[PDB]
């Protein structure tokens, strides 16, 4: 179905601008999903390049869970009839605050962990809203799924802080 | 106990009519549960009679989930002192928009699938309202239970739809 | 559609009446299967309103087994090209000796159990016959499945009888 | 450092005074977590001294769930940067309505069970408030955890009630 | 014992030729067993050459059950002191209806499935007789073993039938 | 109670003398069950005194099975209102053919094996008869049960014989 | 060989009489092992004929443990070059205070439970003396195993007494 | 009931008194059991408040073992008809050496660990005496129970010491 | 579709002749895959008819691995777009050195074992060539696969050899 | 740091000389553990070189238990603050009775097995002493660990004796 | 027969000298195998005496894998008709570079880690060589097994290096 594909993409992209300006849950979650996937790439790097075995294990595992939440929340969206980023182009466009650096393979394990606490704090601005929006839109299942990912982020934050000696307060 | 069990059933029936008017959540779930059981019967039938071994599996599994959710929500309700429909007669009284059919043994697989998509949208009218009604009566556990069932139905609709070739859009 | 479906159905109903009078194995098992499903509901009701949570877990187990035998025997029949009751309608037509009751939610535990002993003794008059017919008809696998059911029913009777402090010999 | 600790703890007693009046979620949860632990002891007691081996094993199973919820919710509180009663002192300070009794070891199994239904009802008056508070504070993961607990308590009340031969209504 | 082998073997050939004439159960299970093995090979071919990854999986699994029945039934036979074919030569001699074809790698999935529906029915003509003969000879355990295999073939027929979108009726 | 218990036993001895004479299924199985338990004791002895660690393990597994079969079949008799021997005195009364020997601890492993081949061939004389009587009496589930036992015994005979380096012909 | 078997068994008989007034640990364990086996027969009886299905399963469970221990300890005795009772004959001769009663199928559940509380207390007179002798002879592993059985027996007395409503003290 | 109870308790506190002077095993284990429960609270505190999430898992694991030994040893005691601490009340009377501290929530991880090395060396003083007493009294199974706990503490001490970078000598 | 099947098979035959000249890898594995299947049958004969139960278990397991490799290398060849024999006729065409024999069922266990030692040594002549050719053709995964099978064979050889009390050198 | 170490080593070597000449349990367990490791090498040899596959498996498993006991007992000792040999040097000094031999590859399976009966009997001479000495030093956990090891050894002796056709007596 | 052993060992000795000269795969694996066993001892020492519980756990797992590779490679060798060192004496003769030190119980965890990093790079000089020699000799399975050991060592080196905060390049 050739002629009608480009026209379905241009009507998706039209609805892409109209939904980011009046915030819908759907559109908000575009940043959240793009954030998960780019976090997943950073955690991949850090699971590979960190020095202690014990911390490579833990970061790889957080990587796994970013991807698990990506699929879980995508499925929850599409279930409720919305749309979802699905390429490097889109993820890079809708991704806020998180940033990669090729140099990070030489950072110390402390400085790696610390960047992940800032990232996850940043991820939590967008998830926080998405919850509020999703309750208003009466998307109940998508709501609870996102509360879960809120809870998980907090838990990661406190675990990474704790691993550096500090408290959640220290940040 | 013979003429003071008739006293109890009469005083549950005065209670039952008074609850459907201002709808209580327990009344509304009288419809969701009765739909679950009757839907379980339809799925049983398609689970036996459909042709594809794969689709007979998937459908027998959805039937099994409807009975699980019957039990789970029935439990949550009795937990919060409410009453639940427990017979064929009662299930027939309160069921809505689902219709059985002995002739469905000879439908084509797709005609069976499609019929369950409509049945499941319909199920979601009464469920969405029971969520709202349960949050209002401050039955928090029930609410989350009914949010889960809601979210599952969405899952089941988008699966049946994909297995016909079609987006959830289409319905 | 419609035309091919109405001829297949009227030819089934014709053939069904004939078979019911001479009895065939599959006709007799229409009563067994219908009994299975109505007991399911009865045991589902009791599994919900009985007080002792031990008797509730046990009765819900007997419900799941009756559905298990529903699918197992249905499959055995379809495997030998018979037809199977598959709606509430046909269940109510063909079920004998077992009787629902919305006032059972207020029965006592001792009395629910006693009703199931009688119920199950009643299911056996029909199973017994379906074994014998199945062997005449040389539907050997089916015969084996129905023997299993016969023995499971005998076991349940003696477990419920023991749970009320009674020998099976009392009943 | 022995003096910086004393400072931090003076601060905590100040902050906690303010928080119990204006009730924050943390502070309501202080009574809930304290109740969990004291119930743990009561149930430890009754799981040892109750005569029926079946009731003993059930009573220890519930004992372990108190601790499980105690850890679960505490992790949720600290994740959102609150604080938790961690000593026998603070538990007795903040515990409400539940009272221990060394002579319970000579109570009958019925009276033990009876006493937990009443304890678990009491526990609920506070949990309710803490769900409501935690929603207010936009502490979503925490809120969900506490609803789970609400649910469990209702389940327990009912099972204990059923085991005694009664309904939820009776109490 | 080299010549005591040769004369043990002429005595097998005398007892075996006498035994096919009247048929014994053993005699008749020679064909049943020989068909399982050759069928096993057909399904090995099909499970490698079919296109559909799912159907490959399902065919490879049936091949495996064909060999499990071969050992199960050979064992039940040797247990009642009968002899069993165990070479390519003998399986070729004794097998009927099931024809191999090096050309079937080139057939269509639908075409393969259909060849197996006919093989399995064909198998059943001998199995059926082996059940009766085994029961007449009062080989009770062999009997129940072969009954089970009868039941399996029916099941495979109907699933194969259902996967082509047909009812068993058709065949 | 002390005279309803003593004249309940006087009628059990009346009923059980009449039944041994027109051999009922239940009374044949009285020898079957007594044989199982006495065999259990012999296998226990051999399981302890045999020299081969491998054989000790196998013999202990067969002892376990004899007990499993004593329970399975005792349960099927009771389900179907029969009665079962349950004391040393009674096992020693109805047991035939199998004879204990405290001197067997000094036997060679091969002689022990030999003594079980003969023991197990002997149990089959009665097991055989009980199947027939069970089908006659239309105790279907029981009959199936005793068919498994018969099969099992046949397979033990063949493995014991093989371990001695002989096919079952020789025996 | 028949002659040396006889000669060895004569020596065995000389050695057992001498060892029974010395009392060695092996001789005392003679009584313990015989008690275990006969208790097994008693638990088997009670596990078949008792009314409560929960109690049947529990009694069977204890029957199994008696046997496990019979083997465990027998193996520990043989390891330490002692001899072990291996026949009904020797068990009857060496057991103490445990008596069987064909009439016990008609006892009440409470009366069976009580009879086992007395049987296990009787069993512990011997176990006790055997632990003490096992330590005297410095058969270290043997002694630890018999400490276990001593403990299991206590666990069991407390559980049977709990079920009957009572405390160990009442006994 | 209410005075049967009140002087069952009078005879307990009276007999507990006599029993703490010629220190019985039961009496001594009152201190050990009380210590276990308070330590459990401490390990809870530290398991929530410690900074390293590896150490938080480990310390929860030790909290959980301490509770299991509370039930194991309590069960062993009651099996031997002895009474056991059941309330915060009695745990505070009988506990010695272990002191709780709400300020602990602000200690370094290393100071937390040291506090436990010393806690566990102190528990061992009473455990050691409890073993000897339990062997004088010939409560064999209770002794083995207590030897296990003794060995567990030692292991904990050495692992704790190890994580501090110290060998066990240094304490 | 019937004349095309016949044309593809003519080209297959054409190509197959050319390929057996230079040998290709796949052509070599024609012999290896045929030897595997034919050996599976020999091993099935010996697995049914050997005397020792332990040898029967082991031979049956070797047969299963013969088949598992047959699938695993056939997949590996199809992946690399080669073709694979798959009928009795081709197996018999390309098989080398392995010879079936109906007389084998009377051989002694030790002679069955010896014949498999020789068979597997022979099997390896073709496996060797196949690895080397797979390397030339750069079929990397097919090569690693066939090395696995080479190792399996050397292992089977030493194990059968050792069961005969002989070293691999002896052969 | 290279001089703190040598004085620590010399105070070790001095302590050890006093300890061996009085014996302590730690010193005695020096022999026991050196014996375990050398045995593990001997069993490793025999597990590689014996002919019978079944016996290789078994010896390899005894080897692995020897190592498990090595860690278990070392830990029990270090927990109780003793020192443990940990180099080839040291095991060779302290090992008694067990004698390695590179020509053992050429022995008969029967001869290898006889060699390990004699070794395990000789191990026990020291283990016995370690047990008495550990009870005397009031190292309770260690005592119980070594009692296990004693029991294992005796069990292994009988099993090897059995596998040669002999009784533990012949030994 | 004592004499033949001596002659076979004499020939072993001759051939060992020939084979270490022109080095065969096998003789090169004499050093590799002996290095595994000595490392196992070093790792045992280090896994008992190291300070950190995490590092003890990890070092023991490496001791375990060394032993597993010793069996895996020894079995591959013997399948391929080679000989394997199997005493302390031989291990000491053929191990290069690794050396034990009884004073290492008093090293720091870091020194222990660095010493294994060096030992493991030393191990690979020989492994590398055995891989080439095995490919040269067409011992295909051996080679693959040894490549797998190589891989493991490299993975071990990086993990140890990482635990010291260092990159592998440092080494």
Which two chains form the greatest contact, residue counts included? D-H, 40 and 39 residues
Number of structural domains of chain A: 1
Main sheet characteristics of chain A: none
CATH T-level fold name of chain A: Ferritin
Distance between the termini of chain A: 53 Å
Our estimate of the beta-strand percent of chain A is: under 5%
Question: What does the overall shape of chain A look like?
Answer: globular
Q: What is the radius of gyration of chain A? A: 17 Å
- Can you say what the CATH homologous superfamily of chain A is? Ferritin, core subunit, four-helix bundle
What key phrases describe this protein's structure?
part of a larger assembly, 11 chains, 171 residues, mainly alpha, Ferritin, 76% helix, globular, dna binding protein, Dps
Q: Would you write up a description of this structure?
A:
- The structure is cut from a larger assembly and holds eleven copies of chain A (171 residues).
- Chain A is mainly alpha-helical and 171 residues long.
- The first copy, chain A, has one domain: Ferritin, core subunit, four-helix bundle (Ferritin), CATH 1.20.1260.
- Helix content of chain A is 76%, strand content 0%.
- Chain A has six helices and no strands.
- The longest helix of chain A is centred in the middle third of the chain and has 28 residues, at 53-80.
- The radius of gyration of chain A is 17 Å and the shape is globular.
- Chain D binds chain H through residues 1, 5-6, 8-9, 37-38, 41, 44-45, 47-49, 60, 67, 70-71, 74-75, 78, 83-92, 100-108, 111, and chain H through 1, 4-6, 8-9, 37-38, 41, 44-45, 47-49, 60, 67, 70-71, 74-75, 78, 83-84, 86-92, 100-108.
């Amino acid at each position: 179905t050739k002629l009608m594909i480009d026209e379905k993409y241009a009507k998706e992209l039209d609805k892409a601008e109209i939904d980011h300006h009046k915030p819908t849950a759907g559109a908000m979650l575009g940043h959240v999903l793009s954030n998960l996937f780019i976090e997943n790439i950073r955690l991949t790097q850090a699971g590979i390049y960190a020095k202690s075995p014990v911390k490579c294990e833990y970061l790889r595992e957080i990587a796994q869970r970013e991807v698990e939440y990506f699929f879980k929340i995508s499925d929850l969206l599409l279930d409720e009839n919305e749309i979802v980023p699905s390429t490097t182009e889109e993820f890079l466009k809708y991704h806020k605050f998180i940033t990669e650096d090729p140099k990070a393979k030489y950072w110390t394990d402390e400085d790696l962990l610390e960047s992940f606490i800032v990232d996850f704090q940043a991820q939590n601005m967008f998830i926080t809203r998405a919850i509020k929006l999703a309750n208003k839109e009466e998307k109940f299942a998508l709501a609870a799924g996102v509360v879960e990912l809120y809870g998980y982020n907090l838990q990661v934050i406190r675990n990474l802080a704790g691993d550096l000696g500090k408290s959640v307060a220290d940040f």
